[PDB]
Amino acid sequence: GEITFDGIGGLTEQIRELREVIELPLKNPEIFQRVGIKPPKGVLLYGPPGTGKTLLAKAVAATIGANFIFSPASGIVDKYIGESARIIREMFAYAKEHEPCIIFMDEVDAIGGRRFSEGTSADREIQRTLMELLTQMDGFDNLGQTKIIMATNRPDTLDPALLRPGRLDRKVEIP
Amino acid sequence: GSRRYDSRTTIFSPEGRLYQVEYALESISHAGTAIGIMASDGIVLAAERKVTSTLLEQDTSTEKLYKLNDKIAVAVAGLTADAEILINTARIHAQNYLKTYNEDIPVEILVRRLSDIKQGYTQHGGLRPFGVSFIYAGYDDRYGYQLYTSNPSGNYTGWKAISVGANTSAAQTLLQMDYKDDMKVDDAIELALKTLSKTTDSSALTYDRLEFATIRKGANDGEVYQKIFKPQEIKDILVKTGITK
Amino acid sequence: AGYDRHITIFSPEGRLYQVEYAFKATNQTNINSLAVRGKDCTVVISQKKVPDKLLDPTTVSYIFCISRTIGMVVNGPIPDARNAALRAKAEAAEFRYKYGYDMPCDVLAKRMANLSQIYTQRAYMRPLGVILTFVSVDEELGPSIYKTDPAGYYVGYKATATGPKQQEITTNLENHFKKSKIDHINEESWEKVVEFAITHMIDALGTEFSKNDLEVGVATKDKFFTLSAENIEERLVAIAEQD
Amino acid sequence: RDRRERRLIFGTIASKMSLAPEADLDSLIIRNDSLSGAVIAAIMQEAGLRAVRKNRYVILQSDLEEAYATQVKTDNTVDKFDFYK
Amino acid sequence: ADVKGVCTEAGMYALRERRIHVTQEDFELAVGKVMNKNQET
Amino acid sequence: MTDRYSFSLTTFSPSGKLGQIDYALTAVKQGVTSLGIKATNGVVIATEKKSSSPLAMSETLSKVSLLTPDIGAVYSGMGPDYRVLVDKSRKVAHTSYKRIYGEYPPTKLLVSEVAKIMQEATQSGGVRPFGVSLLIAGHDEFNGFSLYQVDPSGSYFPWKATAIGKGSVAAKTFLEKRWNDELELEDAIHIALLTLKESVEGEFNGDTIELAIIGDENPDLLGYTGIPTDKGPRFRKLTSQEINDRLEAL
Amino acid sequence: MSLPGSKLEEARRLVNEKQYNEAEQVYLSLLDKDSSQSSAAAGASVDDKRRNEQETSILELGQLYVTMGAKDKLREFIPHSTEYMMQFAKSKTVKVLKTLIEKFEQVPDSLDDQIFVCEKSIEFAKREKRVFLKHSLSIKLATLHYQKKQYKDSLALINDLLREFKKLDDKPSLVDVHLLESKVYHKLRNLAKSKASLTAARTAANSIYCPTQTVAELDLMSGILHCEDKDYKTAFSYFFESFESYHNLTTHNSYEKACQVLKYMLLSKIMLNLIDDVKNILNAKYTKETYQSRGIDAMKAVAEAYNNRSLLDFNTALKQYEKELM
């Protein structure tokens, strides 16, 4: 990460509760296996960008020694058969190879969101992208040494499927 | 600004009739049916009751059948709300005519006031038109029985059998065929009850899902005696025709 | 939702843009008020926001004297607060002229509630963003607090708080009223009630307050009076010299 | 869910993960009525994450209380929403 | 097509009860289900 | 100023719909549970009166209004809309039947008046309907006991038993079985309590429930503690204590 | 005496002050006296109002009667007294008849005497036009046969009644006969049929409102078929829901009824092999109600004996607790 996680201090509450959700299952998958509960799935950052939003995301990755991987959501918008399928999968595959890793997906309203009304106007490209995210999470596939982090200007704008546990269990606010 | 938040739709279409008026007609065709049959010894009116259930009071079927006069009654096709405003004004207009000339209002005279207001409603104010069509049942001592219809377009005609509300085409087609001018009240009722059956698709049709009235000569009057049937009286006539539906 | 800002139509939501934003914008003056009732008094204490040295510190008001008994605190922008104040003052006097009886809180609440509802129904007037806290020691209704909010909804309260720090104040009033097992203050002398009020206010808002940071209006049976600068000081003085 | 349905969720999710003798399943069924099945499964998940994060090897009744209080509320805005007032 | 649904549902009801014979009563219950299918969207 | 919105704010389409009304009908559903039973041995109305803040009292909140001494009304929807329409409903009941005709209004004819106001505020431009539905319950020698609903549409209908607000479909259903033609007023108070118990729990006590009846009354409050000219009005609304006491024997 | 009201109070208190035997001479006296108007309605007095009070008095009397053994005169008396009520209200006759029969079997009774009241009653009704809920009473009539160990006979009677409910008579009557028919099948060990009939019983129940206790009986059978066809987890859950319903009914659900369901509730958990939860069900008094019996003792001894895996320990418990237990 660009900075460590105690040099941005005065965001300390948010530091504290990102640290115990994200760092601990990566370092110690064993405690969550031994209890018999699931490792955590997804974590959400919400609030304006640069409230020290960007800091908190870079900073959790440094301490783990994860790679921080910034994905532009629009680029996940190729206009070819399965290109869109291909890209998501490959990040997930790479997350397990190069483990631990943070897959940071910025804006989830160019590949997700609640749309105009979720009809067809060119809102099926957006619907294909979100469907992919939802199928891997809910299914036989899982998140263990792949952590996915969603970022959104305001959290109310996100599909209620994403708001279920088993997609996003951790939801952090940035005041 | 707010001088451009005007809907500007109570102006003409190129189709020869106002936007809102044409659209309103659709609304009628999506609400209850009224059927008007003019006979040679009565006038028979049938209407199929829109929602019937136990949660409703089923013993009431004056929900669309109002008598405006002693010898004039109307049938509603459209919504309750829209109707009430014209009903009340027709009632008063009846009383103004009665009072001025010492005689009861002729059916066309009454029709004509209601129709000039319906037109009015779009002609002054910009406001929206009605969503009601009436079929008028009345007697006058200058033409015999008269049975008319008016629409929110302000055009009216007289007919010997007509239907308005939903399923106008189907009912009208059957009516033109079985029509006679030697029919009696009871022959008409039987006829009416057949037509209604052929437009409603059911296992059975019940007496409380109908609103019925006939205006016959009577045997307590040389006038015309208006008989407003209620569910239990609908039940009786259903036996009498032997038409169970 | 609907599209309430361009035509006066409904939303399937039930609540319109005019109502929804009137709920929000009622604080931008950085204001907090509470009202408590004594056994036999009613006290209002309100923040007083004199932000400059170009202004006299006692022309800045937010507590209005509507009648001779009835007080009204308006939580809202100051033009809207005075628009409400003007109407309330006439209705209060007109009611006494015609019906021979001074205005009580609940009837003023009702008149204004009906007006606010009509201007939301209209397409030819705007409604206001005012929360009106009406207070008295009514002759038949006892000590009274009746608070209206924008919508045209109003209801009667034990005690109430207004401002962004409403929540902080609430937990202190709750704690007292449960402890004592009554929904009014056991005390019965308006001094001791005023003093108590301030105590719970310091605690909630986290700053010790001066006389020029407070403005006090007191209601008693058959009279309403405002407490002056010296008067506020006398209360404050004790809270600073006890633990 | 029916009341009997509610009972199953508690029983099934508690097998998969640690439990406290303090924590009684019997307790849970009585406390939780009038809720969607989706909400109950959430709380049960939450309590197990919380307990481990709290660096333990057991789910206590205490984490379960805290997770319950968390999931049921997310709104704390009053004196609004006219259509029922 | 709805009529074809009535036989396959009548039979499913019989199947659930482990019967190769189907009464009139199951057939009525099947038709009511089929009517609800036409009402959707 | 006026004269900027003189087009109606309901308009039609080929589906015949009236924008304002569909939105307003939704509002009624989002109210609190209010119900009406005609037991054909009186009329019983019950509704929930509920806090919206911990320091809001509920004994300053009623949803039961008297329209006239012997016609009562209950509602679901927007609070303000109900009070303002209620003032106007009161106005016509008092001036036009008790001075002109010297007596209390007949319910059905009062149902016609209240409907006409609501339909009127839709027909006239620049203003919207009221976003409520009222149940107007009354008694007269001539008509018996009666119950009508008047919609936000300005349509009306009579209903043997009905419910509106939250949990409408289930509340009406359970009720229909428990509703007999010949039903005892005490059992009919229990059924109402029972229904409202199914909508709400954890804040359901009898002193937050407001129930009023058409049938039994108190002459001693109608100025007939002394020798009567007549018995007088049949509506009498319960206090909280009476409600709680019966809730124990539910 | 010489007033209906005063003599109501007196006749009832005569039981309490000493004994029933004194009271009965009073009750018997209520019949001769009082009334100078109306229709015959005690076969010793003409009356309206006295007989109307007599209904509630007869209703008390009859409960005590089963204890007394004096029931036998009442078993005849009720069918003679039906016609008293036809000359009042038809609805009252139907109503009264059902409540009096319900009281006698709520107390323990011999069958022979029970069969006998009902029998006359149902034949007599038929003659007029009253068929309304004499069929409901035939469902009750099945029930005495069921206990008698005339299942085979109950079966014949039940089959005809099913047809009547299903398009010639009342919808709620249907649920109750499907419930009984499930208990009947079960005893013949026809697991297959008992199960299929409950599935029908539930579909019929959710169409309507079914009394609170009835809903719990439904849940009891479901749980029972899942101990015999396994799936003890699912059973347990139902026994939870059913036990809670019996709790809430209080003393309007018999003492004995609540205990047999608890006995099954403990037993399912031990098979399910969560024994420590059997200890949690005991140690709670909201989930046992302080119902302790030899039956209940047995289930804690059996859980203990399993943990120990001592065969000897099971044989000791079984025999000692036996009479209550099996």
Which residues, 6+ apart, have CB-to-CB distance to E32 below 8 Å?
Answer: none
Among the listed residues C192, C136, C130, C208, the one whose alpha carbon sits nearest the alpha carbon of residue C162: C130
Which residues, 6+ apart, have CB-to-CB distance to C210 below 8 Å?
Answer: C236
Beta carbons of D84 and F30 less than 8 Å apart:
yes
**Which subunits count as partners of chain E given 3+ CB pairs below 8 Å?**
G
If you measure CA to CA, which chain B residue comes closest to F169? B55
Assigned CATH for F1-249: 3.60.20.10
CA–CA gap between residue F203 and residue F198 (Å, rounded): 12
CA–CA gap between residue G161 and residue G113 (Å, rounded): 24
> Residue B99: enclosing H or E segment and its boundaries?
helix B80-101
**Which amino acid, residue E26?**
D
Alpha helices in chain C (DSSP H): 17-24, 78-99, 105-121, 166-180, 190-205, 229-239
CA dist G283 to C205, D19, G266, G278, Å?
49, 19, 12, 9
List CB contacts (< 8 A) between F132 and chain D: none
Alpha helices in D1-84 (DSSP H): 3-16, 25-31, 37-53, 61-72
Can you give the CATH number for the domain in which C13 is found? 3.60.20.10
Max Cα distance, chain A (Å): 49
CA–CA gap between residue A29 and residue A11 (Å, rounded): 27
CA–CA gap between residue C4 and residue F23 (Å, rounded): 12
Exposed, middle or buried: residue C141 (CB in 10 Å: 0-12, 13-18, 19+)? Answer: middle
Compute the radius of gyration of chain F from its Cα atoms: 19
What sign for the dihedral angle of Cα A90, A92, A98, A103?
Answer: positive
CA–CA gap between residue F11 and residue B129 (Å, rounded): 9
* Resolution attained, angstroms: 8.8
CA–CA gap between residue D31 and residue D65 (Å, rounded): 10
- What domain count does chain B have? 1
DSSP G119-164: HHHHHHHHTTT--TTHHHHHHHHHHHHHHHT-HHHHHHHHHHHHHH
User: A120 labelled as ligand-binding?
Assistant: no
- The single residue listed with the structure tokens 């002050």 is G17
- The single residue listed with the structure tokens 């035509």 is C7
- Whether the CB-CB separation of A43 and A102 falls below 8 Å is answered with no
CB-CB: which of F7, F13, F162 is closest to B6? F7
Structure tokens at F216: 């039994």
Q: 3-class DSSP state for residue C145?
A: strand
Exposed, middle or buried: residue C60 (CB in 10 Å: 0-12, 13-18, 19+)? Answer: middle
Interchain touch G–C (≥3 Cβ pairs closer than 8 Å): no
Neighbours of C240 (CB within 10 A): 8
Q: Does D17 touch chain A (CB under 8 A)?
A: yes
Q: 3-class DSSP state for residue A153?
A: coil
The full 3-state SS of F104-137, as one line of letters, equals CCCHHHHHHHHHHHHHHHHHCCCCCCCCEEEEEE
**Which amino acid, residue B109?**
I
Beta carbons of F53 and D84 less than 8 Å apart:
no
Torsion, Cα of C171, C174, C175, C176 (10° steps): 130
- Whether the CB-CB separation of G24 and G61 falls below 8 Å is answered with yes
Beta carbons of F158 and B56 less than 8 Å apart:
yes
- The single residue listed with the structure tokens 């996003």 is A168
List CB contacts (< 8 A) between D83 and chain C: 13-15
CA–CA gap between residue F199 and residue F31 (Å, rounded): 12
- Strand arrangement of the beta sheet that strand C33-37 belongs to: C160-162, C33-37, C42-47, C214-220, C223-227
Per DSSP, G253 falls in state S
What are the φ and ψ backbone dihedral angles of B18, each rounded to 5 degrees? -60, 140
Among the listed residues G21, G47, G19, the one whose alpha carbon sits nearest the alpha carbon of residue G32: G47
Region of residue G180 (phi > 0: left; psi between -120 and 50: alpha; otherwise: beta): alpha
Per DSSP, B236 falls in state H
Neighbours of A136 (CB within 10 A): 18
Angle between helices C166-180 and C190-205 (to 10 degrees): 130
User: A50 labelled as ligand-binding?
Assistant: yes
Interchain touch A–B (≥3 Cβ pairs closer than 8 Å): no
CA–CA gap between residue A59 and residue A172 (Å, rounded): 15
Establish, for the pair of chains F and G, how many residue pairs have beta carbons separated by less than 8 Å.
4
If you measure CA to CA, which chain E residue comes closest to G199? E17
CA–CA gap between residue B135 and residue B159 (Å, rounded): 10
Domain that holds residue B195: 1-244
Structure tokens at D22: 């303090």
**Which amino acid, residue E41?**
T
- Whether the CB-CB separation of F142 and F106 falls below 8 Å is answered with yes
CA dist A57 to A5, A106, C85, C232, G107, Å?
10, 11, 51, 51, 74
CA–CA gap between residue G102 and residue G239 (Å, rounded): 26
Among the listed residues F128, F123, F147, F146, the one whose alpha carbon sits nearest the alpha carbon of residue F34: F147
Structure tokens at C51: 């932000």
**Which amino acid, residue D46?**
E
Beta carbons of E25 and G166 less than 8 Å apart:
yes
Give, rounded to a whole angstrom, the gap between the first and last alpha carbons of chain D: 29
- What domain count does chain C have? 1
**Which subunits count as partners of chain B given 3+ CB pairs below 8 Å?**
F
Å between G127 CA and nearest CA of chain F: 27
CA dist C34 to C71, C133, C202, Å?
13, 9, 12
Among the listed residues A35, F109, G227, the one whose alpha carbon sits nearest the alpha carbon of residue D47: A35
DSSP C84-129: HHHHHHHHHHHHHHHHSSPPPHHHHHHHHHHHHHHHHH-SSS----
Max Cα distance, chain F (Å): 64
Experimental method: cryo-EM
CA–CA gap between residue F155 and residue F119 (Å, rounded): 8
- The single residue listed with the structure tokens 């989706």 is D38
CA angle C142, C147, C149 (to 5 degrees): 165
User: A51 labelled as ligand-binding?
Assistant: yes
- Whether the CB-CB separation of F192 and F211 falls below 8 Å is answered with yes
Beta carbons of A35 and D41 less than 8 Å apart:
no
What are the φ and ψ backbone dihedral angles of D36, each rounded to 5 degrees? -75, 155
Pairing state of beta strands C223-227 and C214-220?
Answer: antiparallel
CA angle C79, F1, F115 (to 5 degrees): 105
List CB contacts (< 8 A) between D85 and chain F: 52, 79
Among the listed residues F125, F130, F57, F126, the one whose alpha carbon sits nearest the alpha carbon of residue F89: F130
User: A54 labelled as ligand-binding?
Assistant: yes
Q: Which long-range contacts (CB under 8 A, 24 or more apart) does G6-13 make?
A: G7/G33, G7/G34, G8/G53, G8/G57, G11/G57, G12/G57, G12/G60
If you measure CA to CA, which chain D residue comes closest to G223? D4
**Which amino acid, residue C60?**
V
- Whether the CB-CB separation of G34 and G45 falls below 8 Å is answered with yes
CA–CA gap between residue C48 and residue C51 (Å, rounded): 9
Q: Does G208 touch chain F (CB under 8 A)?
A: yes
> Residue G255: enclosing H or E segment and its boundaries?
helix G255-272
CA angle G232, G237, G238 (to 5 degrees): 100
Among the listed residues D62, D63, D59, D14, the one whose alpha carbon sits nearest the alpha carbon of residue G276: D14
- Whether the CB-CB separation of F147 and F38 falls below 8 Å is answered with yes
The full 3-state SS of chain F, as one line of letters, equals CCCCCCCCCCCCCCCCCCHHHHHHHHHHHCCCCEEEEECCCCEEEEEECCCCCCCECCCCCCCCEEEECCEEEEEEECHHHHHHHHHHHHHHHHHCCCCCCCCCCCHHHHHHHHHHHHHHHHHCCCCCCCCEEEEEEEEECCCEEEEEEECCCCCEEECCEEEECCCHHHHHHHHHHHCCCCCCHHHHHHHHHHHHHHHCCCCCCHHHEEEEEECCCCHHHCCCCCCCCCCCCCEEECCHHHHHHHHCCC
Full set of structural domains in chain G with CATH: 54-326 (1.25.40.570)
CA–CA gap between residue F240 and residue G4 (Å, rounded): 37
Domain that holds residue C189: 2-242
CA angle B54, B58, B60 (to 5 degrees): 155
**Which subunits count as partners of chain G given 3+ CB pairs below 8 Å?**
D, E, F
CA–CA gap between residue A20 and residue D31 (Å, rounded): 29
Beta carbons of D80 and C14 less than 8 Å apart:
no
Q: Does F52 touch chain D (CB under 8 A)?
A: yes
Structure tokens at G173: 């009557």
- Whether the CB-CB separation of F131 and F27 falls below 8 Å is answered with yes
CA–CA gap between residue A128 and residue A82 (Å, rounded): 10
Neighbours of F201 (CB within 10 A): 9
Among the listed residues C112, C92, C208, the one whose alpha carbon sits nearest the alpha carbon of residue C154: C112
**Which amino acid, residue F181?**
D
CA angle G4, G6, G7 (to 5 degrees): 65
- Whether the CB-CB separation of B212 and B61 falls below 8 Å is answered with yes
Q: Does F249 touch chain G (CB under 8 A)?
A: no
- Whether the CB-CB separation of B67 and B76 falls below 8 Å is answered with no
Residues shown for chain B: 245
CA–CA gap between residue C134 and residue C127 (Å, rounded): 19
Q: Which long-range contacts (CB under 8 A, 24 or more apart) does C3-6 make?
A: C6/B5
> How far, in whole angstroms, is CA A127 from its chain's centroid?
18
Exposed, middle or buried: residue D77 (CB in 10 Å: 0-12, 13-18, 19+)? Answer: exposed
The residue extents of the domains of chain F are: 1-249
Q: Tell me the HSE value of G266 on the side-chain side, using a 13 A CA sphere.
A: 28
Structure tokens at C88: 């309330």
**Which amino acid, residue C31?**
I
**Which amino acid, residue D15?**
S
